[PDB]
Design a protein around this ligand. Sequence first.
Ligand code: SF4
Ligand code: SF4
Ligand code: FES
Ligand SMILES: [K+]
Ligand SMILES: [Zn+2]
Lengths: 114, 688, 48, 208, 95, 126, 86
Amino acid sequence: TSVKPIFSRDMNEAKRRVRELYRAWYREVPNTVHLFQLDISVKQGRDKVREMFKKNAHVTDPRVVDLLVIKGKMELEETINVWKQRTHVMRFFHETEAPRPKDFLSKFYVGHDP
Amino acid sequence: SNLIEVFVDGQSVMVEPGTTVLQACEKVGMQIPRFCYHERLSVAGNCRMCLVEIEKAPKVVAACAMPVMKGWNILTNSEKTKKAREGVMEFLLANHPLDCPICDQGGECDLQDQSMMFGSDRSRFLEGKRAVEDKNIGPLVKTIMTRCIQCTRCIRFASEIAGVDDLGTTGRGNDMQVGTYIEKMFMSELSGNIIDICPVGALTSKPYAFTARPWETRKTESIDVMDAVGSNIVVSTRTGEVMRILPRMHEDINEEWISDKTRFAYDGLKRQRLTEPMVRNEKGLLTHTTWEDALSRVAGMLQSCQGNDVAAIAGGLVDAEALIALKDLLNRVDSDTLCTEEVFPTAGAGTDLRSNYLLNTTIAGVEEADVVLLVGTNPRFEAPLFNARIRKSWLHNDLKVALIGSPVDLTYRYDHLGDSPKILQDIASGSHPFSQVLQEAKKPMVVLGSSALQRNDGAAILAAVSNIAQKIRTSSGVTGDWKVMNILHRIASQVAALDLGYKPGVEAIRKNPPKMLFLLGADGGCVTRQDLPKDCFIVYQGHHGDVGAPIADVILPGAAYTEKSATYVNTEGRAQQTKVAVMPPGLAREDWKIIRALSEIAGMTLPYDTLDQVRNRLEEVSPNLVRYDDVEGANYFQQASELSKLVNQQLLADPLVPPQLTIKDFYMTDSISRASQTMAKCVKAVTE
Amino acid sequence: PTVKPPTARKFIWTNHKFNLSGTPQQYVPYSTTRKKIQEWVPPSTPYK
Amino acid sequence: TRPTVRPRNDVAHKQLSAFGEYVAEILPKYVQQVQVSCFSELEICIHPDGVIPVLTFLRDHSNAQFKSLADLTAVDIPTRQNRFEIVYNLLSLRFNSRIRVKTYTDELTPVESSVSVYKAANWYEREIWDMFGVFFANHPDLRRILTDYGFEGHPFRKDFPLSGYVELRYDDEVKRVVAEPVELAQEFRKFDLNSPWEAFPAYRQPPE
Amino acid sequence: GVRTSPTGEKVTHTGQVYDDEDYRRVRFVGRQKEVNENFAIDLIAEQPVSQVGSRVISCDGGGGALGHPRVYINLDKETKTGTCGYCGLQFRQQH
Amino acid sequence: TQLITVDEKLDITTLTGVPEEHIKTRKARIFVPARNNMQSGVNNTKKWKMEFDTRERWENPLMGWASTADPLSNLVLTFSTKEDAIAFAEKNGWSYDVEERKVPKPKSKSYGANFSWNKRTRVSTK
Amino acid sequence: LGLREIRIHLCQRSPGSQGVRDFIEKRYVELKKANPDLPILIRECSDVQPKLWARYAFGQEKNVSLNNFSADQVTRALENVLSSKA
Ligand code: SF4
Ligand code: SF4
Ligand code: FES
Ligand SMILES: [K+]
Ligand SMILES: [Zn+2]
């Protein structure tokens, strides 16, 4: 059960890297809002960043969180330079699609999907 | 050990004495090409494709019929073996018609595949091919005898498994033809299986003709529900539409054969369907509506019901999830009146012990028995694969079979003891010779049909048969691991309903009629509106509108057995699950989902939302319903025997007559078969 | 074709037509199959 | 077997076998298997930790001189725990020869990048990441190279479907190209084309 | 041999027609429904049955390699003609 | 040593990029495919296949084609043994069911049994 | 208001169900002679722990574990269920 680490020997360095990534994204969000001329506020973007961070917050393997921090850094560099368009930034905000049913009854009414 | 050492391509392998070369090569992992060989048929050895070379032997031998000798070296990839295979392929393809684009076996033809693998790639035949006149053997099998390769699997299957002896080879030489020689139709309960065993496109499925192609079909492994055997099948679909049904290999139930109803009920599965919820308008007619309105009406009627004012009847094609959902819904109202159409005697032990309503040995235990007694049943039509197993044990194990009831044709010779029930009283008293026959049997077996329990004196019949079984179990030479008392069911949903604690028979409803009735696919016509009170709110939930639909107030369209993942228990207690082949049509939904939504509307929500939660509830009620392909053993026959001696019932004087006497009554039993055009054609062809 | 005429057939069009795109005589796709699942027709008489 | 059968090259087979023994004898710390195919192709399957020395040896030994990096590939075989097989193809212009070096990694184990040996790999293995998620340690600039910027998931994995999970369309309400879950007008028809009869007896696997 | 539905729509050779309550007929409003007026079954019904003086006959559709694969048809049944599986031509033994 | 110890179970669902709807609501069936009864070959029953459940396919209003909204409909994965398929299903976080392999029982074949002297296994014709 | 059914789950081969098994061939029949209108469903499985499920009026269910119980303990628990009627 001995494996080759990616960057962090334990969970503490991985949590440190998560903290740095969250700090960088929190600093980045107002510049993204102003530069891309988005129709969202800074509060909405920071809440979205916190939403992804809390959504992806049930892992316990250092290599997995290391790779997640790596991919978040790649997205951060794709946002720092103007490589994403307005559409790629607004991919995180699903505005066009209808909100899916959650309770049993509405899913029973709309179709056979469990 | 008495194993002998043989060699396949220089690799040593131990085999039992009497093993063939083909079986040894299959043991080492090599599949010798074959046309006339079949592991469930007798050895013919005429196609000569299995010719293989033994080292230091100057003659190729047919591996399908040659027993192995000690020290034999089998060369399955030698040069002269390939030469023999190429020559036999050339001879087989010399007279075959160029019919591959217009033949239904294309893409799954054994001859095509072995011609591609082991045959040559060009033809030297410069002469003219022969042509064979087509034959007619009924509206089930399309016959093109020009494509036949005279493999004689037809006659072997019809003589050893079907027990018909109506096919044969007429003529001599190149003019030899396979047929019946007269205008006769091959109508058995296992006829369509010949379409499975023909390696060429000579015998094809007539309903399946010119519809699909094997490479573009998706295969979904499911379980048949046409009877209580529980045959494993593969549903071959194409773009969300069911195209055909094939058997699955399962050595313990239905080895590779299925009945004709199983193979040809899909065209009725795609007709006369219920798609939308319907309610009664001001004119008294059933008009379409949304799910919300129908569910609100049913919930509003159910909310005013309490106690024994609401009841339910289970149909023959109902899964365990729907049964437990309806049971929980009615128990939330405190109603214990959940009934089934099929009648089982509840006096004495009742449905407490699983030993007195199950086929307690196995399906395969017929291979170990030596005397089998059939009481008041016709196993050829009630459970055809069970009859096939009995015939196989009769042919191979020299089984002795006796029957009490009408002298039906069972495709083997038996001993017709009579038709009165009173002869059973002679068996327990020892006044009959068959009492001595049962006493001297080492592994006896008594089978009582579920159709014999439909009579008013079913409890007395069950008590007498259990008395016979316990008399010949403890006293005679039975080891103790051998189970004698066996009950053969004919309804797929009966065993699962009895396991969940349903009340067998509809006598409870006829005792005190309720003011609201649930019909979970109850198309048997057991309870009509005449027995019910003046204003009874009948709610029907099923996939086919046949009998219970026109008398209902609210119709809730459910799903069929191919349209949901559903749990069914066969006649030997083995739980199995089906898989979703296609989706239900229209607004039809899953049955337990319908019941859960109905409880949601009425404010009496059941504590399960997904399928696995319902399966956990099923495990809570009875665990053996969630173990799949596992036969849990039943015990305590003596306790049921002691309980059956309490209340004494007298047998009636009417002779035991099964409801299915001929092949005419076999084709239409349930709502799916009654809505089938192929079954109607079969009935018309039989009766004419 | 004045020197070598084409083979005469009974189904070959006697009146060639140009491209009909944008005209009322254009081509509209549709399914050539029939109905798959037949629906149950309720009886026209009340249960009374 | 003259007209329609491909002729054999026995001298090339002998030379490649001799060189494979030579390489497996020089570097026993890292190599695990050396094989020569029937059409004379040399494959040297090595431990991943020796992906940097072995290639360098093949780049610099006077008897190898595999100066050209022809290709760099990842192969996904889900039945193994180390599901990713990484393949280096090397070409030696001096001796006019080709060699193949194969290592194995799973999703989480990083790989030492071979940029310091071959510069062309600086793009090649980067593409591998964009198609497989195989992380390459000490890479100069590792990011996506082929997929979209907001693309989630690695497409060339065998558990990734043919059509993805999202698809693009123009929406006039937001005046933007937006992504929605994929709904195909025609389902991709899956064909079961495998014949149930064994074709090649020479590749028959032993039973269990 | 085309026929006209009571809604005014032409029925194809496959028997397909749109119902009166079907909304999909709105795709034909302002345009035309494209049907083929040469029915293959009607056209093959007019072909005379060829009389031959042999037990079996060979059919390839005419033209040699320009037709269908060659098949052999048995003509032992005097009640009905022997129809080709590809081209639909029928033959009859004159004895 | 440059090696660390991780004893937690493998869980890569956050890295695969698949949406959670096709992660927690799917049932993966791991099985050996059944032999097609129209053929006697057994080469298609040598490897384990892992597939998913079948969702809704409906009709296109234009051409009557089969439209779907399930991306994992055509996904079939091949595994050498059962344990590899189980490990792959648990690694990707798919709830799964597995059915055991059904091999044919060894039969007893004898050509002389067709010509018995007193047994019922005599053939009426050959 | 009153109990409606009794379910006894056990195993045929496990030793922990043995005392429960010692109930069924010994004191079951007279129990069935005492409550003829009460469904007492006995279910066996391959590896389940001994268990006793009691369904009451309006769907209320209670559970009693019968693991490693003697026959006297089994009938004491069963009489507790029969005399509770909660
Ligand atoms: S049976 Fe086989 S070889 Fe004969 S026409 Fe059909 S596909 Fe071709
Ligand atoms: S029709 Fe088929 S199964 Fe029957 S003898 Fe001919 S090839 Fe064999
Ligand atoms: S398989 Fe042995 S001769 Fe046919
Ligand atoms: K066939
Ligand atoms: Zn022709």
